[PDB]
Amino acid sequence: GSDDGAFGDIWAYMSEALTGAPGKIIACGMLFSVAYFGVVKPNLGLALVSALMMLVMANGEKIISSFLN
């Protein structure tokens, strides 16, 4: 596909924000949720799942650009 056009700025902003401040806020939210739900049931596997989700978000732009040319 083409990255430019009438919606090029929106796509650029969303792609940059996926690994930018909103993405970091979401990742911190998952970290806080893992810490909170581990108070009664300590489970560090959810931390690994959160790290994997962060890795997926880090590669989200690449995946989207690969699937949608």
CB of 48 to a second copy, least distance (A): 7
Place of tokens 């430019």: 4
Interface pattern 7-46 for ligand LHG (x via CB under 6 A): ---x---x--x----x--xx--x--xx--xx-xx-xxxxx
Contact of residue 4 among a second copy, ligand LHG, none (CB under 5-8 Å per partner type)? a second copy
Q: What are the percentages of helix, strand and coil residues in the chain, rounded to 5?
A: 70, 0, 30
Which class for 36: exposed (0-12), middle (13-18), buried (19 or more C-beta within 10 A)?
A: exposed
> Least Å distance between CB 4 and ligand LHG?
14
Among 15, 19, 47, 57, binds ligand LHG (CB under 6 A): 47
